[PDB]
Symmetry: C4
Amino acid sequence: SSDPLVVAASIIGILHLIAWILDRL
Amino acid sequence: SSDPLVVAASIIGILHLIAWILDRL
Amino acid sequence: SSDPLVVAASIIGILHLIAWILDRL
Amino acid sequence: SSDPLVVAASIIGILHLIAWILDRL
Ligand SMILES: N[C@]12C[C@H]3C[C@H](C[C@H](C3)C1)C2
C-alpha cells in the first residue's frame, strides 16, 4: 500500500549506502 | 505543502538508488 | 532538537541526490 | 526494535551524504 511502499524505498537506500561505506573501508 | 515536499524529496532519493543498484548488477 | 535534526539530515540527502541526477542528465 | 532500526538506517544515509559533499567541496 501507499504506506508500506515508502518504507520499502527507504530500506533500499540504506542497503545502497552500506555497500558504499564497505567499499570506502 | 511542508508535509508533501518532504515525501517528494524521499521519492527522488529512492529513484537515484535504484539506478545505482541497476548499474552495479 | 532530536526531532528537527532528523529532518535536517533528510534535506541534505535530497540535495545530494538532486546534484547527482543533474550530472547524469 | 522495528522502530529504532529504521532510524539507524537513516543516520547512516546522512553520514554517507556528508562525506560525499565534503569531497565535492
Ligand atoms: N528518509 C530517508 C529517505 C532517503 C533514504 C534514507 C536517507 C534519506 C534519503 C532520508 C532515509
